[PDB]
Design a protein around this ligand. Structure first.
Ligand SMILES: [Zn+2]
Ligand SMILES: [Zn+2]
Ligand SMILES: [Zn+2]
Ligand SMILES: [Zn+2]
Lengths: 471, 471
């Protein structure tokens, strides 16, 4: 094991691990995944019920006791040709599992978390990981970054984030600084921070890596880094008077959830060979007092910046950037422990690759950001992001269709309840996505192999999720 | 005739008509339309040439003498079964007519024009007419508004413009005022102006009106007015601290190109029954001296604000708004004369309804904004604007397909040459539109009945148009 040397015969507990958070995060992961996974054994039972004799009450009762809810009668009308509506019941029960999980974990830290970004020199934190379900837990698990109005997470196949869209967000955010002074006034020396996250598997590099880059780790890193550079060039060249941003590249080993963070130089440039590997930091501080362990991490970040040769930079990163990076590394130590303590090593064989329960498209769920729960593609149209959609369907062809299960798809968007007509335009959008995915995969749709749930939610964190009909 | 009382026995010449402009606009209209229309008689000749006997040089010589260009040899290989490549030749020659017309009319007034907007209290002028080809000449003909960096024209079926897109433009413009002070500094009391344009036919109201609104003039007006109000509500409620815009509604009689302008009140609200009709203004000032004619117009606008009852407003429009409106009315007088002088009354029967030569989608052409030349739909995706594309195809089914002619479609976008990667993102977009229209009308495409041309052009006015291959 690359972080916990003594495994399997002795388990590591890191002195910087937040134990209560790891408990809460574990309860959340098991409970949520259970809600989805228990649908499958339930369907097997339904499938064995004899056709031809009434079994409505029998099915409704089993649903109540197995899933904790009833089913609508019209899904319990067998069709004379194909029998039980297993596809329809799967889609319904899966939508209910999502409702229950988001209601249960719906959510002070708010202002303290933005205060921390501000102090590090950032007025926004915009993060783009790969769409792969094993980065779905990126914010609450891998990085332990609290949800705030200025923390974005927009996932794309291969981390290939939308440059024009990100430019538009930069513009909106900067205008708000000028007009309202939120989260700070425009005279303050802060920058918009864009983070890209690439991933790899250390136990199965050539098969379990980023498939968008052919499981070539070098190509995945370089694509993510090139996208960051291209976004910086857009902001700098599209706007006069020294417009700029900060960039950060993070790599994730999906086997252990450990990060490696690429350290910028004093000019904000990144290098593929200049980084702190948290697996080595974990091992180097495992036997230290908490305060000493923090000093080592602070020193490891600085040491990365004194590098010459291949890793040579123009000086050290700003103090705020180095503080920010130290906190990510510190948080991530808890996550390395999380996996170690739950699995006695790396994630088990059934959780090393893709094991997503649904595809999420749109703005994503704040409430259920859990590893391998969902493949998440941020998009406003299928037309502009067709590849991200095609990659999720490919993944779900192996996961679900290979075993006769439909692909469940959650379409979800945020709106502004203070803006007249915002809710309606968002609903119209949600319904365009639905029709556009149906038209793109029309034979899958004809077989009832695509099961959709549309929803909308006010932009404030903690707002109720509002389900909307497909028409 | 509603403006020139003495027709047909005597023709009016208004003392405020700009004769040199009318001549140049007429030369432009006849020359451009000729380039396109002469393709058809040419194809008839090609169609009558015997198959089986070499006629390559014969076709190349006829093309040179009729069209002023040659044809590629591969278009002149008849296919063994269906003979001459008439659909391919049509598409090619039509794309060359577009190239020739935009090169010929490619373009001091610049700064003077923005100075006039500013003086009237506007830092941007953003205009959304209906996609209908008979509004295509709106800017250089109907309103005589010069092309500037802050003059937008974005056409939609029924004038139903994109509110979110317009919000984003407002944000970008406003940021530029704060950061660069272009076209003015943010402390200046100016506003973003949004204009919506509805249209109707006085000689055939129930058939030749806006089809998006069932040729119901009241519905067309009300929809355009509601969209303006909804855009105003978006800017006001999406942003703190007194964010606001100005709005203006303009009706056009497509038979004569005369406008009716709805006068705002002192709070900026519009009323369907409070307007100055330029047809009545033309008749009332026809026999006056220029200066007296201008006083009548200034007085007509003020008199509309005197209105009680149905047309009651809270006060008079701002002095800058009234000056702006007066200039539009003054300019439009020239256009009323243009039609009268060319046609001896209203447009002739063949030019009363739809007579478009191509469909334009994307950002539109600055250089060929001529009535009934093109149906124009502003869009970044087909998905989001499917109805605008469908309406153009419906129109061209009658115009072109009914006579065995393909529908020519020009896909055109602007990019920023100072932004690294902007050109390539814009080309990728152009190619998405191409494939998305092909897939939406796949049987038309199978029959070679959709002929496309893609192009891209740096954002500065006067930049060369760069054609781009469909793949
Ligand atoms: Zn059954
Ligand atoms: Zn990936
Ligand atoms: Zn031939
Ligand atoms: Zn219309």
């Amino acid at each position: 094991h690359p972080a916990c040397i003594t495994l399997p015969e002795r388990t590591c507990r890191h002195p910087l691990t937040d134990l209560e958070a790891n408990e809460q995060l574990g309860r959340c992961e098991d409970s949520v995944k259970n809600r989805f996974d228990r649908v499958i054994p339930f369907l097997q039972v339904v499938a064995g019920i004899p056709l031809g004799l009434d079994h409505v009450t029998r099915v409704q009762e089993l649903a109540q006791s197995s899933l904790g809810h009833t089913l609508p009668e019209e899904l319990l009308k067998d069709n004379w040709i194909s029998g039980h509506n297993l596809k329809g019941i799967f889609g319904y029960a899966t939508a209910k599992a999502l409702t229950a999980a988001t209601e249960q974990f719906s959510r002070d830290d708010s202002a303290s978390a933005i205060g921390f970004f501000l102090d590090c020199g950032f007025h926004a934190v915009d993060i783009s990981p790969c769409a792969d379900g094993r980065l779905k837990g990126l914010l609450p698990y891998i990085l332990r970054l609290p949800l705030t109005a200025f923390t974005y997470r927009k996932a794309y196949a291969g981390s290939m984030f939308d440059i024009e869209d990100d430019l538009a967000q930069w513009e909106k955010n900067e205008l708000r600084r000028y007009r309202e002074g939120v989260p700070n006034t425009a005279d303050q020396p802060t920058r918009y921070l864009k983070i890209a996250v690439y991933h790899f598997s250390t136990s199965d590099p050539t098969h379990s890596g980023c498939a968008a880059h052919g499981s070539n780790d070098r190509a995945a890193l370089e694509a993510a880094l090139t996208q960051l550079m291209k976004f910086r060039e857009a902001v700098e060249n599209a706007h006069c008077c020294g417009a700029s941003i900060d960039i950060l590249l993070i790599g994730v080993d999906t086997d252990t959830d450990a990060i490696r963070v690429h350290i910028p130089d004093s000019k904000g440039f990144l290098n593929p060979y200049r980084y702190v590997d948290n697996t080595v930091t974990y091992a180097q501080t495992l036997h230290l007092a908490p305060d000493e362990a923090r000093v080592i991490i602070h020193e490891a970040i600085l040491n990365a910046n004194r590098s010459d040769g291949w890793a040579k930079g123009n000086g050290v990163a700003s103090e705020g950037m180095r503080r920010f990076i130290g906190q990510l590394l510190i948080n991530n130590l808890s996550q390395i422990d999380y996996v170690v303590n739950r699995h006695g090593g790396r994630y088990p064989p059934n959780d090393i690759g893709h094991a997503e329960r649904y595809i999420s498209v749109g703005d994503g769920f704040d409430e259920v950001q859990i590893r391998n729960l969902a493949y998440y593609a941020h998009l406003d149209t299928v037309e502009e992001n067709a590849i991200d959609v095609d990659v999720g369907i490919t993944i779900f062809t192996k996961l679900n269709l290979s075993r006769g299960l439909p692909i469940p798809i959650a379409i979800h968007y945020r709106y502004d309840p203070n803006v007249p007509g915002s809710r309606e335009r968002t609903v119209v959008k949600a319904r365009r996505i639905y029709n556009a995915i149906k038209e793109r995969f029309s034979s899958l749709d004809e077989q009832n192999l695509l099961q959709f749930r549309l929803s909308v939610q006010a932009q404030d964190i903690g707002s109720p999720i509002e389900e909307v009909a497909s028409a």
